[PDB]
Short mmCIF file of C-alpha atoms in Angstrom, two decimals:
data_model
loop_
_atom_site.label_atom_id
_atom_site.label_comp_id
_atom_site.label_asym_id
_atom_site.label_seq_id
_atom_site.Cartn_x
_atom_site.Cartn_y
_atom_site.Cartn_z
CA UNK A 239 -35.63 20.60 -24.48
CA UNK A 240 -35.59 19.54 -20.69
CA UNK A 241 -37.26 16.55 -22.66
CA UNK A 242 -33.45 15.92 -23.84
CA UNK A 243 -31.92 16.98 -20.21
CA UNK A 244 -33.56 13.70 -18.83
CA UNK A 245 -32.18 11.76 -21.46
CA UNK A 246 -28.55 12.83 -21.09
CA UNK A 247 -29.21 12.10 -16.94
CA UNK A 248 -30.87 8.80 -17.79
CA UNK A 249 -28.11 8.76 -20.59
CA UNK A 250 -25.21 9.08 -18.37
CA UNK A 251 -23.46 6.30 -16.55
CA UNK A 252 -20.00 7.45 -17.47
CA UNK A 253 -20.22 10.39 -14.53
CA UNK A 254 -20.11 8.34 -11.34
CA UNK A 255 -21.19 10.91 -9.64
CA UNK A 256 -24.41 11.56 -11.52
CA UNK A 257 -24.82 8.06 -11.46
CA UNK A 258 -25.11 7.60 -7.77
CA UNK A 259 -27.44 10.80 -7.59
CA UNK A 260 -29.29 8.82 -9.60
CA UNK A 261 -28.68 5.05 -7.67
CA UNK A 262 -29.79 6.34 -4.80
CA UNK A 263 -32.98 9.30 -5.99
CA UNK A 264 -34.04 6.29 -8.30
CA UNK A 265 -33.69 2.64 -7.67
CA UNK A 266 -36.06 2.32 -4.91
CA UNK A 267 -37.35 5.11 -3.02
CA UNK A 268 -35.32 8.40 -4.06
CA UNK A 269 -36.35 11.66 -3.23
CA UNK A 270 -34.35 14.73 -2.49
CA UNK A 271 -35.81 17.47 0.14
CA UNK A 272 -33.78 20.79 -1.16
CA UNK A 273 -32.40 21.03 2.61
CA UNK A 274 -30.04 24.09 0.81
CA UNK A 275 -26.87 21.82 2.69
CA UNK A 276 -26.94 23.71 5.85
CA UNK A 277 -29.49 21.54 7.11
CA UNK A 278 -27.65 18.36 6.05
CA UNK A 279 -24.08 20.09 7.83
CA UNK A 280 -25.91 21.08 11.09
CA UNK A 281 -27.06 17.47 11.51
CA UNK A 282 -23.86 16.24 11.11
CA UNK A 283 -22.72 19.30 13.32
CA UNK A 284 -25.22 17.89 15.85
CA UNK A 285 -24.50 14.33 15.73
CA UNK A 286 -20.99 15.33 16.16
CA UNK A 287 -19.66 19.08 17.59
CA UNK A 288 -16.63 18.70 16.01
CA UNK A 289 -17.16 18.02 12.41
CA UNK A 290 -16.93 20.91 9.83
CA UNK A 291 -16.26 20.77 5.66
CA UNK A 292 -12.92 20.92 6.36
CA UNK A 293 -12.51 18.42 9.04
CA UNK A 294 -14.18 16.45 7.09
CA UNK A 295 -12.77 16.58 3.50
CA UNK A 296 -9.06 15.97 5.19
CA UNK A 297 -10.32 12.76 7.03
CA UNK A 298 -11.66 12.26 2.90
CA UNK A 299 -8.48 12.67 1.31
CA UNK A 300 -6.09 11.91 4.12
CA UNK A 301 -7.51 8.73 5.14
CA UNK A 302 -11.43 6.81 4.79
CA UNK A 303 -10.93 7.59 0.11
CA UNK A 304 -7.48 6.41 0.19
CA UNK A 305 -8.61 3.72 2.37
CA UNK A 306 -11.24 2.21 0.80
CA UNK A 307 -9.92 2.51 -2.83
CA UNK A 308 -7.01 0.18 -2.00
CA UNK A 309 -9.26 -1.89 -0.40
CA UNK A 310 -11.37 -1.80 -4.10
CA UNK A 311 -8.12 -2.41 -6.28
CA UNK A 312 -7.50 -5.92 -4.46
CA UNK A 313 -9.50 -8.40 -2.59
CA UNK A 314 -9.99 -6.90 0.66
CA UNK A 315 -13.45 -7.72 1.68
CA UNK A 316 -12.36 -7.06 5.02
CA UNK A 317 -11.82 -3.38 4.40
CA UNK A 318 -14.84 -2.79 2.08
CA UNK A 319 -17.03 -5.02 4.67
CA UNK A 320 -16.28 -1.94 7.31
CA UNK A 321 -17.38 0.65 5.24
CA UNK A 322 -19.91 -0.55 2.96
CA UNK A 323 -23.48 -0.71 3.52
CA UNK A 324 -25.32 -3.72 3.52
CA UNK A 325 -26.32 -2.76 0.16
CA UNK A 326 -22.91 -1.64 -1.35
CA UNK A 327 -20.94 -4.43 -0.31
CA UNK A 328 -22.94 -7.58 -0.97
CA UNK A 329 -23.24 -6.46 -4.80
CA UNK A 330 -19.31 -5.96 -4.47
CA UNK A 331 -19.32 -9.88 -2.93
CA UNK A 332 -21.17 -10.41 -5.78
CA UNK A 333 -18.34 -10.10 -8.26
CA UNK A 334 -15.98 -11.84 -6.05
CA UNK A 335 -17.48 -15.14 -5.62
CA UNK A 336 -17.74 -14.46 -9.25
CA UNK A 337 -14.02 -13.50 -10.19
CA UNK A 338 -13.55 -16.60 -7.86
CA UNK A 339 -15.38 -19.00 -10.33
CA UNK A 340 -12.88 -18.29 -12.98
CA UNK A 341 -9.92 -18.81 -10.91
CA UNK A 342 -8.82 -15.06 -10.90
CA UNK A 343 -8.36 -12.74 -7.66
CA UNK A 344 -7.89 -8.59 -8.06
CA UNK A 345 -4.53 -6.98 -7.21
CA UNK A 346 -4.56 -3.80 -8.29
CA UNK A 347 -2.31 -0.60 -6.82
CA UNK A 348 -3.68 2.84 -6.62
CA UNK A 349 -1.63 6.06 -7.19
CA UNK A 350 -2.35 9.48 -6.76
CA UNK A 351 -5.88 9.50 -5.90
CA UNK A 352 -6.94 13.27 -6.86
CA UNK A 353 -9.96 15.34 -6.45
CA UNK A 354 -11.82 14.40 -3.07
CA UNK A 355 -14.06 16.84 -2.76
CA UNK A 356 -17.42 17.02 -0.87
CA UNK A 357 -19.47 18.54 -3.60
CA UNK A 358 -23.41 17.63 -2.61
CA UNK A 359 -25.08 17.31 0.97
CA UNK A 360 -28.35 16.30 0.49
CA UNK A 361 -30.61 14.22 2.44
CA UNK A 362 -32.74 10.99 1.48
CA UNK A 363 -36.57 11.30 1.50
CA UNK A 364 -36.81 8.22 3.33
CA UNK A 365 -36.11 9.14 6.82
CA UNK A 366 -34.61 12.57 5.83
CA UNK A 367 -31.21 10.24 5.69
CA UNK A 368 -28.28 13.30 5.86
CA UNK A 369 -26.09 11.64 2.57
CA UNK A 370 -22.52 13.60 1.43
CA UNK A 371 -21.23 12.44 -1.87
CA UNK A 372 -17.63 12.90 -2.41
CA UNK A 373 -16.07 12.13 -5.85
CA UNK A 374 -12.20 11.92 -6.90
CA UNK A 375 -9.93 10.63 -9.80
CA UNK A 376 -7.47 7.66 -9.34
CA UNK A 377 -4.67 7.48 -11.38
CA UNK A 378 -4.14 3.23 -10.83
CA UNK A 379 -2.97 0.05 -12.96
CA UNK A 380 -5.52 -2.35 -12.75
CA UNK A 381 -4.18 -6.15 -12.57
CA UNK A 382 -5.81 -9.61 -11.49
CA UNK A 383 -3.59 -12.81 -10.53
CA UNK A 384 -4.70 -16.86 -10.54
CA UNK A 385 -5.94 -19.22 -8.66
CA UNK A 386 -2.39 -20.88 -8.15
CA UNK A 387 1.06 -18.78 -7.40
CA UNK A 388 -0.18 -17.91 -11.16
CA UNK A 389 1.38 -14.84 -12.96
CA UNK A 390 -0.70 -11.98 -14.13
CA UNK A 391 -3.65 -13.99 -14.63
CA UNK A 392 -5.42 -13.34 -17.89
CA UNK A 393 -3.66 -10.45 -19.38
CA UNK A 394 -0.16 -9.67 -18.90
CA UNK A 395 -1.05 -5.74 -20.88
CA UNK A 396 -2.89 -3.87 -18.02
CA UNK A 397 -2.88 -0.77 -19.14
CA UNK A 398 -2.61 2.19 -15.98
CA UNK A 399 -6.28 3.95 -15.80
CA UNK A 400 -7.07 6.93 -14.63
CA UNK A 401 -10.40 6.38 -12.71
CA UNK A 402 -13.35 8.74 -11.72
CA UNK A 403 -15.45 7.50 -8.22
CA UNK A 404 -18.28 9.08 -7.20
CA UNK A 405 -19.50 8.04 -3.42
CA UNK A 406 -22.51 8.10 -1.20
CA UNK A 407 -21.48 9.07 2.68
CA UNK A 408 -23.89 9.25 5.74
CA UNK A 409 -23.10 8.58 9.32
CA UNK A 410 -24.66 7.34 12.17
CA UNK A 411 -25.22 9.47 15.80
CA UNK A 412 -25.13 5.50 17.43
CA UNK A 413 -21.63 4.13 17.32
CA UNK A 414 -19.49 6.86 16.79
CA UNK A 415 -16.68 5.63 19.47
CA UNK A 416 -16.35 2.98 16.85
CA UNK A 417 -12.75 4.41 15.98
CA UNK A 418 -12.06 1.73 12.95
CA UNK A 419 -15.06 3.54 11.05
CA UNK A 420 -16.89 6.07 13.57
CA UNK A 421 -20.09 6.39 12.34
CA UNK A 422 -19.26 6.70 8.57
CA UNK A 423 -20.45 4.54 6.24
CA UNK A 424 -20.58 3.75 2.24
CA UNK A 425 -24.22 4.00 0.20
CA UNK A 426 -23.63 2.17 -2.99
CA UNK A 427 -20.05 2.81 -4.22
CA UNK A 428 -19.72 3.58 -8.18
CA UNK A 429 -16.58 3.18 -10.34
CA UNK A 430 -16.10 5.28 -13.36
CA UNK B 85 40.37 -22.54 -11.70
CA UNK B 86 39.82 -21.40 -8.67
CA UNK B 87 41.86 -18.02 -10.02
CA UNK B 88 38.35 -17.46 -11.73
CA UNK B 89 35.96 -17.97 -9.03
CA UNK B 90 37.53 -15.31 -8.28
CA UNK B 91 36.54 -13.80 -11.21
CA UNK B 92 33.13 -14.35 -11.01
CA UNK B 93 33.03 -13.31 -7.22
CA UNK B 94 34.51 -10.21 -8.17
CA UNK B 95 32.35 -10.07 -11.85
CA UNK B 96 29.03 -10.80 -10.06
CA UNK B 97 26.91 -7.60 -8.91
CA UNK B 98 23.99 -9.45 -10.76
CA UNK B 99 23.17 -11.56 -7.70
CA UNK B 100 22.72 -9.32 -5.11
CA UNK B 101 22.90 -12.18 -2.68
CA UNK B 102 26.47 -12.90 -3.05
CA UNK B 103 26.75 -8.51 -3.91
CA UNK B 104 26.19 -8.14 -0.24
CA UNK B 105 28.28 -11.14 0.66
CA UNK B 106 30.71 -9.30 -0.59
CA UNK B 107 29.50 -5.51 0.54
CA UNK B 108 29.94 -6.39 4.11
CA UNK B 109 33.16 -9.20 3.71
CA UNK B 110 35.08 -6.75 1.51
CA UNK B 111 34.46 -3.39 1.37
CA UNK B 112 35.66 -2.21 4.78
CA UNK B 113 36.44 -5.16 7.46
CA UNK B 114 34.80 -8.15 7.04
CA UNK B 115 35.44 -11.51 7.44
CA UNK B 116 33.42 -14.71 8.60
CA UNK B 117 34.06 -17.25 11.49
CA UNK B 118 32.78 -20.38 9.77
CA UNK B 119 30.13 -19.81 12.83
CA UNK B 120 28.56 -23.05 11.53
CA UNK B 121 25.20 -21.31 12.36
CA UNK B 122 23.96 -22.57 15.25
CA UNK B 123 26.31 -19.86 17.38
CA UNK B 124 24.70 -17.43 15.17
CA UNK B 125 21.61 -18.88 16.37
CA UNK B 126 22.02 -19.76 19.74
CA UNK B 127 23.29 -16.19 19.58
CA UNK B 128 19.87 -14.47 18.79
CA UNK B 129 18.24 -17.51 20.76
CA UNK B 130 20.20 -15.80 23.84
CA UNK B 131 19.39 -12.29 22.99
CA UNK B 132 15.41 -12.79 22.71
CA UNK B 133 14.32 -16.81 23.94
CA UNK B 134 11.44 -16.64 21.67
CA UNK B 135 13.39 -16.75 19.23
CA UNK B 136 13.27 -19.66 15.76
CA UNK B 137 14.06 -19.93 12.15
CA UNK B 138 10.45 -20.22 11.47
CA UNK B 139 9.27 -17.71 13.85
CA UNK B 140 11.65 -15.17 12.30
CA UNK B 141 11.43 -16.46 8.91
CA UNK B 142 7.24 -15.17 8.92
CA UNK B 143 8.09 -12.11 10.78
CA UNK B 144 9.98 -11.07 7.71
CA UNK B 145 7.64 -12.08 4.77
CA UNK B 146 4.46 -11.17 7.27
CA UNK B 147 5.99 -7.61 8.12
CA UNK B 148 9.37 -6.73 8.10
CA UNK B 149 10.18 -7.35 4.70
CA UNK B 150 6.76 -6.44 2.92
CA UNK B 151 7.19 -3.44 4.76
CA UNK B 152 10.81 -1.96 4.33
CA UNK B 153 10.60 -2.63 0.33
CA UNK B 154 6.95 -0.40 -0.28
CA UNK B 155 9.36 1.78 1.87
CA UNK B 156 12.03 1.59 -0.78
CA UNK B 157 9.76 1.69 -3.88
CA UNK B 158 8.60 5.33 -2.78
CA UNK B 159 10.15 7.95 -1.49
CA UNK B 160 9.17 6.79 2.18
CA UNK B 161 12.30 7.93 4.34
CA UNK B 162 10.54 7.99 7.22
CA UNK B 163 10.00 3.96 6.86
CA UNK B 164 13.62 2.97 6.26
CA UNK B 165 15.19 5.67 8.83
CA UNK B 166 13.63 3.25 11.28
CA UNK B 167 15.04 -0.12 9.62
CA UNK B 168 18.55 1.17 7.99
CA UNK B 169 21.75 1.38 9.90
CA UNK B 170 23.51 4.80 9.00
CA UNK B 171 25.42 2.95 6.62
CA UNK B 172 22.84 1.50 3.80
CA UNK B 173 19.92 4.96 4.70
CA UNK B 174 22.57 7.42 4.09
CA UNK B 175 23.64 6.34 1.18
CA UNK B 176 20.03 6.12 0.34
CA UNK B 177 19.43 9.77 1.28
CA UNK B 178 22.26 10.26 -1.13
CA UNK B 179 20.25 9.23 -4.23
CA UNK B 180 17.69 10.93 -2.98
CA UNK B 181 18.71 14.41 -2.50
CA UNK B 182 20.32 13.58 -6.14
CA UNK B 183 16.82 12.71 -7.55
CA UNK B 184 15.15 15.71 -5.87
CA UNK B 185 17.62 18.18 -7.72
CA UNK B 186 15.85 16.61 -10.95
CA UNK B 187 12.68 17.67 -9.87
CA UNK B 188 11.05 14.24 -9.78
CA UNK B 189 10.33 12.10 -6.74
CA UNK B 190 9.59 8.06 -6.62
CA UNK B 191 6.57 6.58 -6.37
CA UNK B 192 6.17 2.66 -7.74
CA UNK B 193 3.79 0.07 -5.78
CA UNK B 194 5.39 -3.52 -5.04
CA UNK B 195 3.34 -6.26 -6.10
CA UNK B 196 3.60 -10.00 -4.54
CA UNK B 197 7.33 -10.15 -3.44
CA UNK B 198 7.66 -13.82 -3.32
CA UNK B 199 10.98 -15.63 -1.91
CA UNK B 200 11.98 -14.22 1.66
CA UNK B 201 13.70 -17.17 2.75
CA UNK B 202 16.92 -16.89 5.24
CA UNK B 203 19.72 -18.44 3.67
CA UNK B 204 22.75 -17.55 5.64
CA UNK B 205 23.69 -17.32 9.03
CA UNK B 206 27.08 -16.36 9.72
CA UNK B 207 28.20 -13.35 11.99
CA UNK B 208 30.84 -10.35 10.92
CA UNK B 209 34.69 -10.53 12.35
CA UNK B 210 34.68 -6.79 13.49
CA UNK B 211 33.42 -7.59 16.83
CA UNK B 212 31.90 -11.07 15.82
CA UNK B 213 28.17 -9.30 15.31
CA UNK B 214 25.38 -11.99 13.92
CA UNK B 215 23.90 -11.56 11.18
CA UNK B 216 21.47 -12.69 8.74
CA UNK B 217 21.40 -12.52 5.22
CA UNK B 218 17.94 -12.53 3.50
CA UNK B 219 16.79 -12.53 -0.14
CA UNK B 220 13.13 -11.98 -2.10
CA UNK B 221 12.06 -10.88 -5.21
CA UNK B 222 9.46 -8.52 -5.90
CA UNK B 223 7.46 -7.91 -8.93
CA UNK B 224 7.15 -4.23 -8.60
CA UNK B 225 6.03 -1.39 -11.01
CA UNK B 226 8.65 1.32 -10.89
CA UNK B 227 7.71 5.15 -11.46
CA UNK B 228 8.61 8.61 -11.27
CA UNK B 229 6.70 11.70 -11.05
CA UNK B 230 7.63 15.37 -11.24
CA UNK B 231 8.04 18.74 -8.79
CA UNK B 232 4.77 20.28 -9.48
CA UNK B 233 1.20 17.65 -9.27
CA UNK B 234 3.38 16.64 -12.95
CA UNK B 235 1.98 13.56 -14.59
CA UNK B 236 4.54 10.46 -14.40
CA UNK B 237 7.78 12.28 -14.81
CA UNK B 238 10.06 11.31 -16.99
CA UNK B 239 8.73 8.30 -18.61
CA UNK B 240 5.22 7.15 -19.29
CA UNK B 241 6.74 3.73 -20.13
CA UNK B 242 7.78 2.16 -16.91
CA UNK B 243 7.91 -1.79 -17.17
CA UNK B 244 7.00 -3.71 -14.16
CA UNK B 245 9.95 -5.22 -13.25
CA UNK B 246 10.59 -8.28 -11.00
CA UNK B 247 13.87 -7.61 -9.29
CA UNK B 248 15.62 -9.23 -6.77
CA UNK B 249 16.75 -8.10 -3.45
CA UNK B 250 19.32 -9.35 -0.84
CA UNK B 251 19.45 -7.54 2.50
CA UNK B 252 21.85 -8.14 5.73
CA UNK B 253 19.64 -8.39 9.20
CA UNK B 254 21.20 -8.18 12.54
CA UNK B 255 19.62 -7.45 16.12
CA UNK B 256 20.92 -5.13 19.34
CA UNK B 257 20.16 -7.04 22.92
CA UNK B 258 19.75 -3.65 24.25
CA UNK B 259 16.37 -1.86 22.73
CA UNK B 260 14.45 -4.76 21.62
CA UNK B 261 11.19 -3.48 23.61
CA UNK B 262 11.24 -0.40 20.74
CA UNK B 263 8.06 -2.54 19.25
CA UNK B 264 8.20 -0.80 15.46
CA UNK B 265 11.47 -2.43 14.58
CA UNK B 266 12.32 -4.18 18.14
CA UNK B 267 16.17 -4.71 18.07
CA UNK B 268 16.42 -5.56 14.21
CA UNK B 269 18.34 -3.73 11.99
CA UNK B 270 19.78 -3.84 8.10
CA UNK B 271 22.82 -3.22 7.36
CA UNK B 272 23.50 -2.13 3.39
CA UNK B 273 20.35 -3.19 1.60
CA UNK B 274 20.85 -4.08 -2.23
CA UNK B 275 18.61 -4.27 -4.87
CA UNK B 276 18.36 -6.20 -8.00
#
């Protein structure tokens, strides 16, 4: 039985958010300490006074998700390259000096953007790393362009999606009077 | 012959350009001096020094026009109370309260807007005020959604149109150091 509940995790993929839970607890080093949140939300409440769910989960919805998710839909490495991690963003780079290749850039246009909710603090085994994963739908129509002043690129049908994100948050008690970012930053970024 | 470029004048509405031509030279007082430009120019030249075609020309595919159109697309008031005289936003706010009684509220996303190019310079005979006239087009996706977190409104259909737009620009000597819109103005706005 809980022989076939590892298969189904392992077996996922199409929940983001169970697919960073698993990115992060199984790539490299992954390991999960059972803090039981309060732990993870004092640290935060430490590193910062003023922070609490709420405060929090408005700066989410009102600003860093619908943020960042423009900055996905197009090519704006310079948005992504604020709030990604090392890790996160050079994979996204990845695809863009690929997309490049075949003479294609990604304009996209978000709408709606529901859900954004904090649903897991946990922390990372190594270095008890305090880690918030938020995850939200976004209704948006998907499009890429070409290389010269050229139309809709490859197909003119792009259909409007209706996305699922799941996302890794963690901040940092050094360089919090940042005020682009403060502190916050992206762990691997999934797309549903 | 000329009894039906008349006609056509008249019989246009298509071209928003010459719609507006007409909006401002018809509807209540207008008439043009045959400025020849350059008064026009040497007109906003006095009014702010740092002042050229090509400095303006950016300014309004850079920001002003990028921005007052994502305005328009949506139901962003807020935007085009700062840009339209109380002639073209009221008559805005009229459609609007009118689509609000319908339970359904605009939301669309404007996608690479290519044109912006000042074509006309030529100032109004009711007190001999300069203005410029300045067209675009935007390939745009235009939606609706409803009263109550309600899917896409009316239609799930909407094309993505590529209309055209043709607006009227004029500045004000006195308040240019307002820095969001800084003296500029638009007098009725039309769309394609």
């Amino acid at each position: 039985s809980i022989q076939s509940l590892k298969n189904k995790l392992w077996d996922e993929s199409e929940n983001p958010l169970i697919v960073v839970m698993r990115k992060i607890t199984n790539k490299v080093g992954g390991f999960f300490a059972e803090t039981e949140s309060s732990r993870v939300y004092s640290q935060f409440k430490l590193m910062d006074p003023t922070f609490s769910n709420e405060s929090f989960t408005r700066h989410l919805r009102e600003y860093i998700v619908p943020e960042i998710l423009e900055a996905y839909v197009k090519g704006d490495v310079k948005v992504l390259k604020k709030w990604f991690s090392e890790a996160p963003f050079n994979v996204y780079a990845a695809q863009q000096k690929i997309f490049k290749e075949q003479d294609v850039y990604a304009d996209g246009r978000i709408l709606d953007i529901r859900g954004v909710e904090i649903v897991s603090a946990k922390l990372l085994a190594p270095q008890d790393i305090p880690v918030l994963v938020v995850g939200c739908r976004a209704q948006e129509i998907n499009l890429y362009r070409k290389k010269k002043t050229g139309e809709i690129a490859a197909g003119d049908e792009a259909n409007i999606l209706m996305s699922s994100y799941a996302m890794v948050f963690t901040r940092d008690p050094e360089q919090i009077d940042d005020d682009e970012t403060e502190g916050w930053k992206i762990l691997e970024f999934v797309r549903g």
